[PDB]
Amino acid sequence: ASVHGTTYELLRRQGIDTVFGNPGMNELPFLKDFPEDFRYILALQEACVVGIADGYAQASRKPAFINLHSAAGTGNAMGALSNAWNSHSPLIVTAGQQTRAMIGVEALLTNVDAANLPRPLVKWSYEPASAAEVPHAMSRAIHMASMAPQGPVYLSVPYDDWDKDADPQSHHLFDRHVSSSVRLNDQDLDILVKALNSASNPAIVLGPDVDAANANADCVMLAERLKAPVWVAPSAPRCPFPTRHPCFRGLMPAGIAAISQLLEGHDVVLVIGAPVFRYHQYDPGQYLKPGTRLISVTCDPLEAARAPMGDAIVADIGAMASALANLVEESSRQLPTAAPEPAKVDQDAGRLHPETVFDTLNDMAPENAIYLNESTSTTAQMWQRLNMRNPGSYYFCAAGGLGFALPAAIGVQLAEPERQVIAVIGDGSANYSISALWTAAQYNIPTIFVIMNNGTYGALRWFAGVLEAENVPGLDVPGIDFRALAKGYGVQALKADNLEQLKGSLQEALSAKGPVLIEVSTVSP
């Protein structure tokens, strides 16, 4: 068989049936004779291609396949690649390389030193030394992406390899099954269990790897057993817990001092599926107040090694959560009391306060909605005013890289056609990957886009104030008609200048059958 055929067989047999891409001259020899059991998803830009794939991989909890054009295409995606890395997304990035005979002369379309391009934002980057090796390298890439901790990979392949004769011994790759579903040995696990049952005032902290592992329900059972308060690790890329559950305590502020102070009083603090920690703002202080010990359970050796305090276990989050939830005894302590309901902010007949939007989104959206956030100045209000009962109901750019929510909201919706995806994106952030809108329309992927328009970078201006920094240029974004952009890419558009219009626009988008964008006028800071 050919490399072309042997490779499509490898993907098939590994459970791959979708290729998100933007094509070039180097990817043609691979894209040709596109099998009937595969489906192609075009995006007009590479950051969009990878963002859609990303959203898709995270929601489906399975690797996504990507096909990009040489260096220019690989480069245009590296922003999105930055987010994927931080979110442990299993992305198999494949880029086309110039014909082997033209690489030396560095002809146009030649990915020079290709393996180094994506570094250091990838787990594995490689260019095969021969055509016949392609299938095997594809196997490595697939498994390298899928193994815990999950992450994006990169494979460069000359477009002249696809027609070449594949190595018959390649068939051994087809049904290779690699497992990293592992957990702490019985002995050291019983000691951890013992320590948990002996804790007088334990707290729990959950990160994105919990939602990734669909370990959410096990973490609920674990929290209820231990009758422990639950927090989401700072800068959360996902939601690992029910926001209305009695134990839930909200999202931790992304600061050293704020976190140690919040943990003060708790003797044992168990962190699951989160870096320790994902700080953001400057808040020098004590990592942990005396009397508080920390135990981290991550699937990433890099997270475990860099943690400034506490002990760590490197195991699979799905396996560990399940074991712990089924091992720990039921504490007699009283079950924590659910946090009070956020008060309703005063709203006039003019511009809408972000608080009003969320309260409104929470009232009208189906219970199994899926929210994406890239309204940077309103993350706190969002996490508080949005009741998210189910797994994989929240997504936020994991390396803080803007341009992720728009496309990712498309990939998620594609992966979850039964759940209404609602992307909440600031007017600034909506520009980074605006072209992505075209994909939602072309394939009729029914994402509802909510654009919060403050005419500026609320977040940036804020930080500006927390630095007393005056005379900063480039913070305003006036003169952007999001309705016209939506029209440009064939997506139904709507506007809400007030609460009355907001309620109306939302009505009509949940009833609509295709993608819908709503530009909402929000107060300025």
Residue 515 engages Ca ion in binding (rule: CB under 5 A): no
Count the residues of the shown chain that bind its own copies, applying the rule CB under 8 A.
153
Distance CA 43, CA 439 (A): 6
Tell me which residues in 189-228 interact with ligand TPP (CB under 6 A): none
Residue 24 engages ligand TPP in binding (rule: CB under 6 A): yes
What b/e sequence results for 186-224 when a residue is b if at least 16 CB atoms lie within 10 Å of its CB, and e otherwise? eeebeebbebbeebeebbbbbbbbbbbbebbebbbbbbb
Provide the minimum distance between the beta carbon of 260 and its own copies in the complex, in angstroms, as a whole number: 9
Provide the minimum distance between the beta carbon of 71 and its own copies in the complex, in angstroms, as a whole number: 5
Residue 428 engages ligand TPP in binding (rule: CB under 6 A): yes
Which of 307, 386, 408, 509 lies at the binding interface for its own copies (CB under 8 A)?
307
Q: Judge whether 366 and 416 are in contact, CB under 8 Å.
A: no
Query: Which tokens in the block code for residue 518?
Result: 């709503």
The annotation status of 427 as a binding-site residue, yes or no, is yes
Distance CA 480, CA 482 (A): 6
Query: Which tokens in the block code for residue 186?
Result: 């019985």
Residue 133 engages its own copies in binding (rule: CB under 8 A): yes
Partners of residue 354 on adjacent β-strands: none
Which candidate, 251, 258, 253, 259, places its Cα nearest to that of 230?
Answer: 251
Given CA atoms 441, 488, 412, 380 in this order, what sign does their dihedral have? negative
Q: Judge whether 8 and 35 are in contact, CB under 8 Å.
A: yes
Residue 348 engages its own copies in binding (rule: CB under 8 A): no
What burial class does residue 432 get, using C-beta atoms within 10 Å of its C-beta: 0-12 exposed, 13-18 middle, 19+ buried? buried
Residue 479 engages its own copies in binding (rule: CB under 8 A): yes
The annotation status of 119 as a binding-site residue, yes or no, is yes
Residue 482 engages its own copies in binding (rule: CB under 8 A): yes
Q: How many CB atoms lie within 10 A of CB 5?
A: 14
Provide the minimum distance between the beta carbon of 200 and its own copies in the complex, in angstroms, as a whole number: 21
Report helix, strand or coil for 458. Answer: helix
Residue 378 engages ligand TPP in binding (rule: CB under 6 A): yes
Tell me which residues in 77-96 interact with ligand TPP (CB under 6 A): 79
Per-residue contact track with its own copies, 63 to 92, x per CB under 8 A?
-------xxxxxxxxxxxxxx---------
Residue 518 engages its own copies in binding (rule: CB under 8 A): no
Residue 504 engages its own copies in binding (rule: CB under 8 A): no
Query: Which tokens in the block code for residue 128?
Result: 């095969």
- 18-21 and 64-69 strand pairing: parallel
Which of 72, 103, 147, 195 lies at the binding interface for ligand TPP (CB under 6 A)?
72
Provide the minimum distance between the beta carbon of 228 and its own copies in the complex, in angstroms, as a whole number: 22
Residue 427 engages Ca ion in binding (rule: CB under 5 A): yes
> Which amino acid, residue 418?
E
Which range touches its own copies (CB under 8 A), out of 346-354, 384-392, 474-482, 508-516? 474-482
Residue 471 engages its own copies in binding (rule: CB under 8 A): yes
Distance CA 221, CA 322 (A): 9
Q: Judge whether 358 and 386 are in contact, CB under 8 Å.
A: yes
Distance CA 217, CA 506 (A): 30
Q: Quick check: bond before 277 cis, omega within 30?
A: yes
Tell me which residues in 274-303 interact with its own copies (CB under 8 A): 275, 277-280, 282, 284, 286-288, 301-302
Residue 513 engages its own copies in binding (rule: CB under 8 A): no
Picked from ligand TPP, its own copies, Ca ion, none, the partner binding residue 378 (CB below 5 to 8 A depending on kind) is ligand TPP
H-run or E-run covering 124: strand 124-126
Residue 377 engages its own copies in binding (rule: CB under 8 A): no
511: Cα separation from own chain's centroid: 27
Which of 63, 73, 240, 273 lies at the binding interface for ligand TPP (CB under 6 A)?
73
Picked from Ca ion, ligand TPP, its own copies, none, the partner binding residue 132 (CB below 5 to 8 A depending on kind) is its own copies
The annotation status of 117 as a binding-site residue, yes or no, is yes
Residue 375 engages ligand TPP in binding (rule: CB under 6 A): yes
Q: Judge whether 65 and 53 are in contact, CB under 8 Å.
A: yes
Q: Judge whether 20 and 65 are in contact, CB under 8 Å.
A: yes
Provide the minimum distance between the beta carbon of 205 and its own copies in the complex, in angstroms, as a whole number: 15
Tell me which residues in 430-459 interact with its own copies (CB under 8 A): 431-435, 438, 441-442, 457, 459
Provide the minimum distance between the beta carbon of 292 and ligand TPP in the complex, in angstroms, as a whole number: 32
Annotated binding site for Ca(2+): 427, 454, 456
What are the residues binding ligand TPP (CB under 6 A)?
22-24, 46, 69, 72-73, 76, 79, 374-378, 400-403, 426-429, 432, 452, 454, 456-460
